[PDB]
Design a protein around this ligand. Sequence first.
Ligand SMILES: Cc1ncc(COP(=O)(O)O)c(C/N=C(\CNc2ccccc2O)C(=O)O)c1O
Ligand SMILES: Cc1ncc(COP(=O)(O)O)c(C/N=C(\CNc2ccccc2O)C(=O)O)c1O
Ligand SMILES: O=P(O)(O)OCCNS(=O)(=O)c1ccc(OC(F)(F)F)cc1
Ligand SMILES: O=P(O)(O)OCCNS(=O)(=O)c1ccc(OC(F)(F)F)cc1
Ligand SMILES: [Cl-]
Ligand SMILES: [Cl-]
Ligand SMILES: [Cl-]
Ligand SMILES: [Cl-]
Ligand SMILES: [Cl-]
Ligand SMILES: [Cl-]
Ligand SMILES: [Cl-]
Ligand SMILES: [Cl-]
Ligand SMILES: [Cl-]
Ligand SMILES: [Cl-]
Ligand SMILES: [Cl-]
Ligand SMILES: [Cl-]
Ligand SMILES: [Cl-]
Ligand SMILES: [Cl-]
Ligand SMILES: [Cl-]
Ligand SMILES: [Cl-]
Ligand SMILES: [Cl-]
Ligand SMILES: [Cl-]
Ligand SMILES: [Cl-]
Ligand SMILES: [Cl-]
Ligand SMILES: [Cl-]
Ligand SMILES: [Cl-]
Ligand SMILES: [Cl-]
Ligand SMILES: [Cl-]
Ligand SMILES: [Cl-]
Ligand SMILES: [Cl-]
Ligand SMILES: [Cl-]
Ligand SMILES: [Cl-]
Ligand SMILES: [Cl-]
Ligand SMILES: [Cl-]
Ligand SMILES: [Cl-]
Ligand SMILES: [Cl-]
Ligand SMILES: [Cs+]
Ligand SMILES: [Cs+]
Ligand SMILES: [Cs+]
Ligand SMILES: [Cs+]
Ligand SMILES: [Cs+]
Ligand SMILES: [Cs+]
Lengths: 395, 395, 268, 268
Amino acid sequence: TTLLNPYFGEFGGMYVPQILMPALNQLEEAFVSAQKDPEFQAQFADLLKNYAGRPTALTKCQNITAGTRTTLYLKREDLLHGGAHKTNQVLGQALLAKRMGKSEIIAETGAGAHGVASALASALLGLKCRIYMGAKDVERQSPNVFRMRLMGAEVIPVHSGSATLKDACNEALRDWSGSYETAHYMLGTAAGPHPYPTIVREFQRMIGEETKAQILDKEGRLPDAVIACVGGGSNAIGMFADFINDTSVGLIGVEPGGHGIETGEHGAPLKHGRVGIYFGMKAPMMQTADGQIEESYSISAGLDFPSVGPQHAYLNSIGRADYVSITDDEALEAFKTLCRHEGIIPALESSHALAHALKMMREQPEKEQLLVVNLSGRGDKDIFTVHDILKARGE
Amino acid sequence: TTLLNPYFGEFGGMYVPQILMPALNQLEEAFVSAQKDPEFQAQFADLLKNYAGRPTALTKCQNITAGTRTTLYLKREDLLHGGAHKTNQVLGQALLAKRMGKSEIIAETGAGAHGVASALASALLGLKCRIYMGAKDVERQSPNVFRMRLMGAEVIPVHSGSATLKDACNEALRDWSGSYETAHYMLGTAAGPHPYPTIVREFQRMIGEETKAQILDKEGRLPDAVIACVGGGSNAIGMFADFINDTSVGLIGVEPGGHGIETGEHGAPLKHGRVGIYFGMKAPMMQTADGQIEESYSISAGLDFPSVGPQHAYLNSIGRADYVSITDDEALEAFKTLCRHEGIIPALESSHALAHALKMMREQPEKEQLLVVNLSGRGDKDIFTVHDILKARGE
Amino acid sequence: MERYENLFAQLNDRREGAFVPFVTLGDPGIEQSLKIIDTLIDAGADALELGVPFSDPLADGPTIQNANLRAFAAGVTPAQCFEMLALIREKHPTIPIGLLMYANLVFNNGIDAFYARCEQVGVDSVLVADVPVEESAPFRQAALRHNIAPIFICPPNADDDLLRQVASYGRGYTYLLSRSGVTGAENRGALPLHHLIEKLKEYHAAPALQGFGISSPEQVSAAVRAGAAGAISGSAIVKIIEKNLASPKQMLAELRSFVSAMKAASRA
Amino acid sequence: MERYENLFAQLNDRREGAFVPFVTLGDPGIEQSLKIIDTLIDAGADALELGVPFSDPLADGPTIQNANLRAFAAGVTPAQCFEMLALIREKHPTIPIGLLMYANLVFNNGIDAFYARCEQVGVDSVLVADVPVEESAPFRQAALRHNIAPIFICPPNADDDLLRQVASYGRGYTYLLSRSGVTGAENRGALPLHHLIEKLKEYHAAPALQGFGISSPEQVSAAVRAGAAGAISGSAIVKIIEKNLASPKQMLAELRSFVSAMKAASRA
Ligand SMILES: Cc1ncc(COP(=O)(O)O)c(C/N=C(\CNc2ccccc2O)C(=O)O)c1O
Ligand SMILES: Cc1ncc(COP(=O)(O)O)c(C/N=C(\CNc2ccccc2O)C(=O)O)c1O
Ligand SMILES: O=P(O)(O)OCCNS(=O)(=O)c1ccc(OC(F)(F)F)cc1
Ligand SMILES: O=P(O)(O)OCCNS(=O)(=O)c1ccc(OC(F)(F)F)cc1
Ligand SMILES: [Cl-]
Ligand SMILES: [Cl-]
Ligand SMILES: [Cl-]
Ligand SMILES: [Cl-]
Ligand SMILES: [Cl-]
Ligand SMILES: [Cl-]
Ligand SMILES: [Cl-]
Ligand SMILES: [Cl-]
Ligand SMILES: [Cl-]
Ligand SMILES: [Cl-]
Ligand SMILES: [Cl-]
Ligand SMILES: [Cl-]
Ligand SMILES: [Cl-]
Ligand SMILES: [Cl-]
Ligand SMILES: [Cl-]
Ligand SMILES: [Cl-]
Ligand SMILES: [Cl-]
Ligand SMILES: [Cl-]
Ligand SMILES: [Cl-]
Ligand SMILES: [Cl-]
Ligand SMILES: [Cl-]
Ligand SMILES: [Cl-]
Ligand SMILES: [Cl-]
Ligand SMILES: [Cl-]
Ligand SMILES: [Cl-]
Ligand SMILES: [Cl-]
Ligand SMILES: [Cl-]
Ligand SMILES: [Cl-]
Ligand SMILES: [Cl-]
Ligand SMILES: [Cl-]
Ligand SMILES: [Cl-]
Ligand SMILES: [Cl-]
Ligand SMILES: [Cs+]
Ligand SMILES: [Cs+]
Ligand SMILES: [Cs+]
Ligand SMILES: [Cs+]
Ligand SMILES: [Cs+]
Ligand SMILES: [Cs+]
């Protein structure tokens, strides 16, 4: 029994060990209660505005669309405190943790952005925070490990499996299953068991709300499409949510194509996987013929996850949202292009969304289109990775 | 002959080789013209809001003042695009460069924050940017070198002298003296020859303006004091300017005390130097008995400069503003304290201002005081330096 | 069939509890796994709980994680596990065989088809670790259609509604969780479970086996004394495999003595 | 005194231009510097321009930057430079001596006191590199009070107002800048300066010496042919010091031949 619908069509649900159901039910109840509580809402609003820096800018990028009929705006989640959109929902979930009397936080991270957001919110609000991070991601996103430790969070390297995000998720869930009385699992994306896909969307939806208001103010109309990268689904559903009922507005999610879909080394289960049950949810999975969960791959640690949140699978199934992929190389070009021509250093994750927008423009340069890319984070964490890549290319 | 007063009392002026006077006069004229030009103002406003992310939050920090009668707010220049207040005036000066038909930018940097700001503004606005940076600062603020190069700026290591900020300034000025027809010198602080101290203040004054409005909204009165670190003077004068005529409001600037004033290894000329002529201005200098300019020292590359802007020297002389110092160790403690208790990672520069505010609180804990610290930047650039220090301490 | 029903009736007559070992099928290889399982039975196991190697066993701690990995290193697939189950049932006609599954392996090629295959090879029960009661409908329906007992978990944090559901929906045995957390011999359950055991009996639930953290004969006796019908032990058994990889002979000897001792504890 | 006035009157009578070398005082040491300066004079220098080592010489390129550093390595101070100037004037009663100063060294112990010291030791002019006309009042006033010629710069980018000011305020000689930029032999001035030379003459300015980038006899002749009263050469001279640090004898020989050749170029 739940208060809210755990499914989006066939996708979603609560596929966790029985032991964890009371924790999920408690979380759902606290969320429903909080959503009706003006004091909770005011506290949340206060943190978003005065601590995190909302609303974020919507930047019109002129140089990179020159000579085309594309007008491109970037929603600047890269300017949020912490440096990524991850901060928004962490503030809301930390307040739920406190509401439920939890004193500890467990989080997974890949890009380290969610880890950093979890650590900063825990420092501010008086929670003891432990982060699971794949050992591969520890190296390729190291700036973030430094940040987390300085803010007093415990960072636990995970060497199992691919030593990336999936493996960190696994460990976080294992931990929670034995510590849920005292620890809240601050899941970092719009995926996992209900009620997380719902909560994460509702605590990210200000992205799209602000975008809509900003676009109307500047352009007097809605965008033709909004475009976001999809790792687990949070920044994209945060951008999409307020536009779902505006049927003229394209919703485009960009999965990582890695070394190319045909190589099998990608993170694009929504379009190239098949429905399975893992990480608490029924959702598209990269899986073997036999039903073993595969390892994903992306140059971007934050998109390196072999599944996807269920609301995205649903929105795809009904044709409301469209999903595409962008390779490592395409994302790297978009990264370089934004740095050099707009003076903005984007996260490699967000660079996937940008790459698709640039493709939309370049493929049809005389098509009039008003586009918004969710610039989900800044790329400080990626500057060393990108350096090493460009160096090996002799650039 | 000038349009504007080049002096603040005895301090300031235009002590450059004759060759550079037309460049200074042209810059002054363009500034005076721009300040009266609604189109310039609107373009500048547009960039500050929609590109840089202004206005910045004013955050009330609760944990770190618990048990005292200090209320402490942080003005969040760390959330500005680029990660420091340096971005504000760079946008204005880049627009002046364009107004004057310059196609190239020269900048010095120490912390790399001004370098990054110069590079990003040049990428956006179509200028070819070259940055001088001391070789010591290249290492201790390396994240910034990566950022500048990705945005297409040329970064030139300076090995001369102390291989720090002073030396970079020297090289930038030498360069400008032979390239001023095509290159604008985008000086990174409220110092140097007129009209730079005036321009930099006017292009930073939104800091204090916003602070005043925010404090009034939240507290219904002005702050007892506003507190800022002083490297060359820009973030501090940006905070101070709008409060100068509010005589009840304390203006406190914090110079780096380095290893301690008594060691001579500091960057505190305003309080521990004496008036001299260097870097285009008559201003307090760290100098030998013989009148040679000394080398400064600070753990923080951005404060490691042996002089200070003339308006600060003036405001000190008349008693309108008070100047103090904070040592490397005091700044490190403030850094750690903010990370752990507010979940904000501050620049080591800004940490000097915070340290003084914490001292004001701790020394007199039952004194009722409403304080604002200008949190001039984020400390991403410093995380490696701080790690290495804490590691060597066995922390 | 009625393998559990017959076992518990026989056990009740001898006034004894069940000892039920867990191992991963194909750990550390198919042939050695088959020998291990024969040794468990010869040493006095009353039933088996058998894990199919899964890529991401989220209810398992390191010991059994490593069992899964060893099986995968030997190239063990679900198909080969079904071949093994056929060979085990062929040798041992009466022993109840329960599978420990993760959902994706059951869902992968169709839920109904999975249970149909279990029936074909002579499996008696299926426990799907990451399917709570709330999601159980298609699993339990398919199980019952194919004469497989659906195994439900009664956690220490079970309320009355959950006891009633588990009592109604389950067959074969009720799984009584020692404690929160994941599998492992290093963490023993700290909560007394007598109240849950009595409630299950009142609601006519399948007989209860206690599992998680059971690593010593004393804990086996205590479960039985507390009113449970027996106990399951996994990590403790798997540890003996892991310790003796290089000596298959000493592996079997040590498994025999351990199982013997654990089983003897169920006799009073 | 009137050392410049006498020099230019003598030069005009011989229909020739001045050749004026620059060196840094105390580069590469006090004793060697004194010998270098005697060699410059013996080889035909008409006047001297002498730099006092300064920590931050912002109008100087690498060659002269390095001269400053060498002097500092030898521990040379402004006080020791004044001692040297006394020794030079003691040997050479008639040669005009101009200092190249940076502002802080003049301001440091009081502007008036600085010029008083210059007068005491027998210096004829002072050029303060980082003081434009706009800031010059206390410097030029103190210079004139102590019978020192204040040297003003006429840049290539000079407007009419600046020509008039430089003509009025200056004494001794007018410094005619070859080009923008800093000192150095590697960058030769590209602008013709004949228009500025004529305007200075019309406004009765002190005679003009061209400086910056003058490294060859041809450039000396060209300055004189263009109507200037002579030329200054610094980096070219200092390069010979730098090249010959390890051979003081070959240093002096090479300085002699260079200065001889440069001076000969001023004769037509
Ligand atoms: C700037 C930026 N932009 C986009 C993304 C993509 O994540 P999305 O917006 O949720 O789709 C990330 C994801 N980053 C991860 C992965 N986070 C993550 C991903 C999947 C499962 C669990 C996770 O913690 C992290 O741990 O920070 C990001 O940092
Ligand atoms: C975050 C932050 N906070 C405060 C400061 C202090 O500089 P202030 O606010 O101007 O006093 C810096 C100064 N940083 C320098 C030095 N900039 C600099 C300093 C002195 C002379 C020339 C310079 O370019 C840079 O080059 O970025 C900073 O980064
Ligand atoms: O002795 P231990 O601690 O290794 O435990 C052995 C357990 N092996 S098992 O197949 O019974 C078993 C039973 C239930 C499990 O998860 C669930 F409770 F969520 F369903 C996992 C394994
Ligand atoms: O031959 P070069 O290129 O080395 O030039 C030698 C110049 N030495 S100097 O003392 O005349 C001299 C004259 C003026 C200077 O700066 C100023 F113009 F700003 F005032 C600097 C040095
Ligand atoms: Cl739905
Ligand atoms: Cl359903
Ligand atoms: Cl609640
Ligand atoms: Cl609400
Ligand atoms: Cl630490
Ligand atoms: Cl781990
Ligand atoms: Cl808005
Ligand atoms: Cl509305
Ligand atoms: Cl409009
Ligand atoms: Cl559309
Ligand atoms: Cl549409
Ligand atoms: Cl599909
Ligand atoms: Cl695609
Ligand atoms: Cl004033
Ligand atoms: Cl004055
Ligand atoms: Cl203008
Ligand atoms: Cl204005
Ligand atoms: Cl590059
Ligand atoms: Cl250089
Ligand atoms: Cl405001
Ligand atoms: Cl007002
Ligand atoms: Cl108020
Ligand atoms: Cl006050
Ligand atoms: Cl006051
Ligand atoms: Cl003083
Ligand atoms: Cl002090
Ligand atoms: Cl695992
Ligand atoms: Cl492997
Ligand atoms: Cl546990
Ligand atoms: Cl220098
Ligand atoms: Cl040295
Ligand atoms: Cl030049
Ligand atoms: Cs366009
Ligand atoms: Cs993904
Ligand atoms: Cs307080
Ligand atoms: Cs300073
Ligand atoms: Cs039953
Ligand atoms: Cs004159």
